[PDB]
Amino acid sequence: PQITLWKRPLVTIKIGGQLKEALLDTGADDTVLEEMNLPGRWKPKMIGGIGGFIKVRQYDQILIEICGHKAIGTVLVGPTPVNIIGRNLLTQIGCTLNF
Amino acid sequence: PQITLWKRPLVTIKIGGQLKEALLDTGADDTVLEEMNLPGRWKPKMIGGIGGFIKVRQYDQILIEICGHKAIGTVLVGPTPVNIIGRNLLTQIGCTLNF
Ligand SMILES: CCOP(=O)(COc1ccc(C[C@H](NC(=O)O[C@H]2CO[C@H]3OCC[C@H]32)[C@H](O)CN(CC(CC)CC)S(=O)(=O)c2ccc([C@H](C)O)cc2)cc1)OCC
Numbered sequence: 055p056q057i058t059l060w061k062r063p064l065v066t067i068k069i070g071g072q073l074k075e076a077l078l079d080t081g082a083d084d085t086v087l088e089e090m091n092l093p094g095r096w097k098p099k100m101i102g103g104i105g106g107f108i109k110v111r112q113y114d115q116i117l118i119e120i121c122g123h124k125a126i127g128t129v130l131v132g133p134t135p136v137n138i139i140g141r142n143l144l145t146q147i148g149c150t151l152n153f
Numbered sequence: 154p155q156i157t158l159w160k161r162p163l164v165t166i167k168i169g170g171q172l173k174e175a176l177l178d179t180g181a182d183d184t185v186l187e188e189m190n191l192p193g194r195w196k197p198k199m200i201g202g203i204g205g206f207i208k209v210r211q212y213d214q215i216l217i218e219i220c221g222h223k224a225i226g227t228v229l230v231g232p233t234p235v236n237i238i239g240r241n242l243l244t245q246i247g248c249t250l251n252f
Contacts, residue, residue, distance in 0.1 A: 055251070056249050056251050057177060057248070057249060058249055059248060062166060062240075063179050066250045076180055078180070079174075079178070079179060079180030080158060080177060080178055080180065080250070081178030081179070081237060082175050082180055083161070101203065102203070102204060102234075103204045104202035104203065104204065104207060104234070105201060105204030105205030106205055107205060108203055108204055123252065132218050134203060136180075137202070138180055140157075141158045141161075142159050147252050148252045149158060149195075149250055149252040150154040150157050150181075150251050151158070151250060151251075152156070152248070152249050152250075153202065153220075153243075153246050153247045153248040
C-alpha cells in the first residue's frame with residue numbers, strides 16, 4: 055500500500071505465530087521488539103538509540119509477516135519503548151520513501 | 154524522489170540558514186536536530202527512545218527545506234547523535250511509505 059504519515063505508521067505483524075503491533079521505522083537500521091518469548095537460539099547483542107545503549111537478544115533468520123508480506127531476518131528483543139520494524143526488514147518487503 | 158532503504162535515508166536540509174545532513178524518519182513523531190544556537194524563544198523538553206531520555210530545546214515555527222521542499226514546524230534541538238526529520242515535517246513535504 056501507500057502509507058501517509060499523519061498518524062504513526064503502525065502495522066500488524068505475525069511473529070513466532072502471534073500477532074503484534076509494530077511501527078515502520080525508516081530511522082532504524084534494525085528491527086527491535088519488546089520483551090517476548092521467541093523460539094530458537096539467540097546471542098547477546100547491544101544496540102544504541104537516542105538515549106544510549108541497551109542489551110538485547112539477537113535472533114537470526116526469524117520468519118516475520120508484516121502486513122501480509124513475508125520477511126526472514128534478524129530480530130532483536132529487549133527494552134525498546136515501542137516495537138519497531140527497521141530497514142533490515144523494510145527492504146525485504148520492498149518499502150521505499152516517496153515524495 | 155524515491156528513496157530506497159538499503160542505506161540510511163540521509164538527505165541535505167537547510168535550517169537557520171545552514172546546510173546539514175538528516176535522516177528521513179517515519180518512526181519519529183517530531184524532528185530533532187543537533188545542537189545549534191537558533192534565535193528565538195524555546196521551551197525545555199525531555200524526549201525518549203532506546204536507551205532513555207535526552208534534554209532538548211523546543212522551537213516553534215521553524216523553517217526547514219528538505220531536498221528543496223519547504224516545511225514549517227516544531228524542531229527539538231539538543232545532543233542527539235543524528236539529525237532526525239520526523240513526521241511533523243515529512244507530512245508537509247508529501248512523504249509516503251510505499252510497498
Ligand atoms: C551515530 C549513531 O549513534 P548511536 O548508535 C544511535 O544513533 C541513532 C539514534 C536514533 C535514531 C532514530 C531512531 N532509531 C533507533 O533508535 O534505531 C535503533 C534500531 O536500529 C538502530 O539503528 C539506528 C539506531 C538503532 C528512531 O527512528 C526514532 N526514535 C523513536 C523510537 C520510537 C519511539 C525508536 C525506538 S528516537 O530517535 O528515539 C525519537 C524519540 C522521540 C522523538 C520526538 C519526541 O518525537 C523523535 C525521535 C537513529 C540513529 O548511539 C548510541 C548511543
